Amino acid sequence: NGLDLMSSITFSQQDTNNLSHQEQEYLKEYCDLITDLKSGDLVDIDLSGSLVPPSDAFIDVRVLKDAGEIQTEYGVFNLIKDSQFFVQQSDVERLIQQGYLQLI
Amino acid sequence: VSPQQDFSDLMKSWKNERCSPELLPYPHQLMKRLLNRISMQSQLIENISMGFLDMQNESKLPLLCMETELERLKFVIRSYIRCRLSKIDKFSLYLRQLNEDENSLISLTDLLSKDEIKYHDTHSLIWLKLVNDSILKYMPEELQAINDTEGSVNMIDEPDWNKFVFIHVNGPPDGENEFGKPCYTVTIPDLKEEVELTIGSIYVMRYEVIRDLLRDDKVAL
Amino acid sequence: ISQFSEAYNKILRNSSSASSCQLVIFVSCLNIDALCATKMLSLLFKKQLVQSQIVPIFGYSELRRHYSQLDDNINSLLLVGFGGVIDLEAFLEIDPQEQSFRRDIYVLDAHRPWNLDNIFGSQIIQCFDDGTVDDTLGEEKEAYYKLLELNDLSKRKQRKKQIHEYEGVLEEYYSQGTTVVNSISAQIYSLLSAIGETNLSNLWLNILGTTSLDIAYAQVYNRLYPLLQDEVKRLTPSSRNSVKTPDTLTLNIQPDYYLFLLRHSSLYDSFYYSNYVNAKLSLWNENGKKRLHKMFARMGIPLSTAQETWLYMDHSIKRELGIIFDKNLDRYGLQDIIRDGFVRTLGYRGSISASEFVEALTALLEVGNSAQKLTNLRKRWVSNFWLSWDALDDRKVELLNRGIQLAQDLQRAIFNTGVAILEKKLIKHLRIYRLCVLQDGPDLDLYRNPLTLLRLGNTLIECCAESEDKQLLPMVLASIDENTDTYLVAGLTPRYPRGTKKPILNNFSMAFQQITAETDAKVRIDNFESSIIEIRREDLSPFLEKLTLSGLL
Amino acid sequence: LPAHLQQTFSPEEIQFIVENEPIKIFPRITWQLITTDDKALNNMVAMRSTEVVLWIALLLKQQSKCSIVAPQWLTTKELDRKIQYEKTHPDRFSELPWNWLVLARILFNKAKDDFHDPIHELRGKIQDLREIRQIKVLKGLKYLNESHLQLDNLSLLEINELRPFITEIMDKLREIHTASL
């Protein structure tokens, strides 16, 4: 999840309806369960992301057919297919999980 | 009490955590003073970053430094607790049986975080609720309770104290436990005779024989 | 009109901030010089860790889609290779915002003459005109201070006579051919040396830049060798090898050849496809093909040894590669082959000729990848741009070779088809100028790219004129596959046989704008270059007739 | 849920760890910053060595505003005594900085031009000392028993690579043997 600005659980998990609704209730209840952990910290977290440590600390992201610009948080990165942003690890973590960024 | 030391202890805790087969006490005294400290510097850097634009009709370095640092240490604890929550996910039952029993130390406000306890009970709840409307309907009368039969078993597992963990022996010498020839500590495995332990050399053994050394932090993992 | 270092400190002060930054440097467009420039530029930014956007623009019309759409916080903008011809102040408009204007658009261009509206009347620039044409250039200087802001009847008549007096000479200016003075890269390096960075791969970027265009003239480049060779003298990896050594291990001077792909292809195929030698030896002809073999009979190089890849040829032939050519080539009139060139050795991988590298990148640009189709195609070129951008990096060589296996193939296409033309004698000498059109051919997919027709057009204008009396006459080409009769037609410039008296200033730029202003029949300047336009087969023929007359040259 | 690895450390994580070790630097520079854990420094004097943490040296090296010192143990003339001392005690693994692999990867990426005779030498040396030492580990690994091992002085990376293996088949081995008495 998914990740900035989560901001809702949607379009994820290609299994969707094919997987049993009994599990999906558990699932939605579970991400609802983790929203509270998100709400205790005050880290900030971003717990969902950054399993792999920052270096260093600016990277280069090459657009991958994404539109864009949807980068509202922090700044309007103005997403544009065939455009690489010499941007800090910060918004890279959040945006790479979605599927916009490609090369770290 | 120094920041650097709280950090060294943070790292120490982090390693000891990812190594050991089982859960460790929740170190609130430190982890909370860091959870206050980062709330301080994250506000401070945004304040100095915003005040910096006023002298602007210079050097971004201490700001970049600072910020990178904060990314690193905000990673560290996030690995920590993201790990512990997993071991809670695996030990939920064991912990439950540990809670219903009197002796010795149950979850309380200590063994788990005031944040973690919520995660534990809610996960446990929604899990039981999942399996309940899924496969127990259709409920065996003996199998109503989730606990030992015994056998096999279930869970119970895994407070596994015999698992191997790489350990590196470090701690202040008085010249407590040093019996020679090089140094501390005992050892005394139950199945075997002492090696015993040498301090400049890492020696892999069971987690149980060393748990007390772990408590004292006389051996890193 | 400014010190490079000071323009730099300006783009420094408006740059670094919270949030960073913001600037979009526009790399444009299809010209290898652009890469050469903006890569050392981008590395320079990464040095001070200044955030940047970098955009692969193809179409000149395409730039409007960008600048008009996404701009928010960007107080300092940078642009490359555009605006020297057509002014963006009118094109973008601007509309002054807030003196001490908030946004500074730097425009870097090698093209001349500058637009009149650009240099004088400072709004968006911050011009890069420095230092090539300063000049004066008194013709643009009197163009404004006179014009602006401009018994009484004779003073009115006198005044107006003066106004037209300035307007005539002014009309001489800005109506003219577009010709590159110096490679933008060179100047970025002049900007770079004042800051104090001597970096080796940087310098290699300069060498790449300069040698981007030697396919087309120099023109000043013949005297650029001091400005490079001295720099190659300002550094050195080791006083003596010390073989290799595995690191530094850098670029050096060698007797390089306009000969094509000597090091990464078989020798015989390296003459047979080379561009300068296509001409003098009449290689499209079967009767001339033999003359090559006679060259090899003169060299004592086996035919079988000529067919073998250059890595593996015998050592004796290598040591004699700089001699045998002296002994023989002189007799065939091929005496201009041996340049003093630059070669960077990566050691155990191989070595690479400055020029051949450029052949690799060009190779990358077109291959190895109703308005929806053209947009999607130009898009494919935009993606492909980065596939070409990556090859510049040292750490990945593995794909650079994917360029070279292409660069060979392209020639094998280009040469082939090129010969397919001369067999039918498709050249129309006309009267005022030479002209051609390809009505049919194999694999027009390769010919979609502007630069492909720049190189085919180049080998062809090079082939027709050795010289080859008389009258170097600019050439025209056309091709069509899909996108409903787009029939791309690129302007060209004559080639002197190494003895070049005048720049000669391609006039198609003007001749096309005269027609866009006349009946404008399906005429599209959409491509960034003034020499190359688009047309439809319906309106191409009346366009060709209106091209024939009135001739501006 | 850490997913990977999870029981062993990640190769990257041990660099994430080692970069917390301080090493000396040669600053070109002449705010504050307190940061948190640094404690340093009063404004660094150009042409004056000082002791700081690694990740900042690396950070300030990307900007080439500082020249890192080479470790006294990283030299080819120094390494020579170490492989000499290693061939001649086939049992013990000698004396290791314990980070030496990972510092050998890290300091070679950027700092390489700072070293005296870095080229085609030290990499040849440590790629060697990372050879005979590795096979010596695989031939010292036949003597496996529960529960003891002397792995003596051994790198963090070397620990991390073989960890799942040893601490897994020790958990199949000791598992039958504890349980058969």
Curated annotation (Swiss-Prot), chain A:
Entry's Gene Ontology BP terms: DNA strand elongation involved in mitotic DNA replication; DNA-templated DNA replication; double-strand break repair via break-induced replication
GO terms under cellular component: CMG complex; DNA replication preinitiation complex; GINS complex; nuclear replication fork; nucleus
Cellular compartments annotated: Nucleus
Keywords noted in UniProt: Cell cycle, DNA replication, Nucleus
Source domain of life: Eukaryota
Family: Belongs to the GINS1/PSF1 family.
Misc. comment: Present with 1431 molecules/cell in log phase SD medium.
Biological role: Required for DNA replication. Functions as part of the GINS complex which plays an essential role in the initiation of DNA replication by binding to DNA replication origins and facilitating the assembly of the DNA replication machinery. Required for the chromatin binding of CDC45.
Subunit composition and interactions: Component of the GINS complex which is a heterotetramer of SLD5, PSF1, PSF2 and PSF3. Interacts with PSF2.
Protein name: DNA replication complex GINS protein PSF1
Species assigned in the record: Saccharomyces cerevisiae (strain ATCC 204508 / S288c) (Baker's yeast)
Lineage: Eukaryota, Fungi, Dikarya, Ascomycota, Saccharomycotina
From Swiss-Prot, chain B:
Impact after mutating residue 87 to E: In sld5-2; temperature-sensitive mutant. Defective in DNA replication
Cysteine pairings via disulfide bonds: none
Subcellular localization: Nucleus
Taxonomy, superkingdom: Eukaryota
Effect on the protein upon substituting residue 14 to R: In sld5-12; temperature-sensitive mutant. Defective in DNA replication
Listed GO biological process terms: DNA-templated DNA replication; double-strand break repair via break-induced replication
Keyword terms: DNA replication, Nucleus
Major localization class: nucleus
Any one GO cellular component localisation term in the record: CMG complex
Quaternary organization: Component of the GINS complex which is a heterotetramer composed of SLD5, PSF1, PSF2 and PSF3. Interacts with PSF2.
Family: Belongs to the GINS4/SLD5 family.
Purpose: Required for DNA replication. Functions as part of the GINS complex which plays an essential role in the initiation of DNA replication by binding to DNA replication origins and facilitating the assembly of the DNA replication machinery.
Name of the protein in question: DNA replication complex GINS protein SLD5
Whole-protein coverage range: 54 to 293 of 294
Swiss-Prot record, chain C:
Subcellular location: Nucleus
Similarity field: Belongs to the CDC45 family.
Source organism per UniProt: Saccharomyces cerevisiae (strain ATCC 204508 / S288c) (Baker's yeast)
Name this protein carries in UniProt: Cell division control protein 45
Pfam family, any one: CDC45
Other notes: Present with 1730 molecules/cell in log phase SD medium.
Keyword Methyltransferase: no
GO biological process, one term: DNA replication initiation
GO CC terms in record: CMG complex; DNA replication preinitiation complex; nuclear replication fork; nucleus
Iron in keyword set: no
Assembly and binders: Assembles into a complex with MCM5/CDC46. Interacts with MCM10.
GO molecular function, one term: single-stranded DNA binding
Function in brief: Required for initiation of chromosomal DNA replication. Acts at the origin of replication. Also has a role in minichromosome maintenance.
Domain of life: Eukaryota
Keywords, sorted A to Z: Cell cycle, DNA replication, Nucleus, Phosphoprotein
Swiss-Prot record, chain D:
Keywords tagged on the record: DNA replication, Nucleus
A single BP term in Gene Ontology: DNA-templated DNA replication
GO terms under cellular component: CMG complex; DNA replication preinitiation complex; GINS complex; nuclear replication fork; nucleus
Entry-linked InterPro entries: GINS_A (IPR021151), GINS_bundle-like_dom_sf (IPR036224), GINS_Psf2 (IPR007257), PSF2_N (IPR056784)
Keyword hit for Transferase: no
Compartment list: Nucleus
Principal location class: nucleus
Pfam families: PSF2_N, Sld5
PANTHER family, per database record: DNA REPLICATION COMPLEX GINS PROTEIN PSF2
Family: Belongs to the GINS2/PSF2 family.
Function: Functions as part of the GINS complex which plays an essential role in the initiation of DNA replication by binding to DNA replication origins and facilitating the assembly of the DNA replication machinery.
Subunit structure: Component of the GINS complex which is a heterotetramer of SLD5, PSF1, PSF2 and PSF3. Interacts with PSF1 and SLD5.
Name under which the protein is recorded: DNA replication complex GINS protein PSF2
Annotated source species: Saccharomyces cerevisiae (strain ATCC 204508 / S288c)
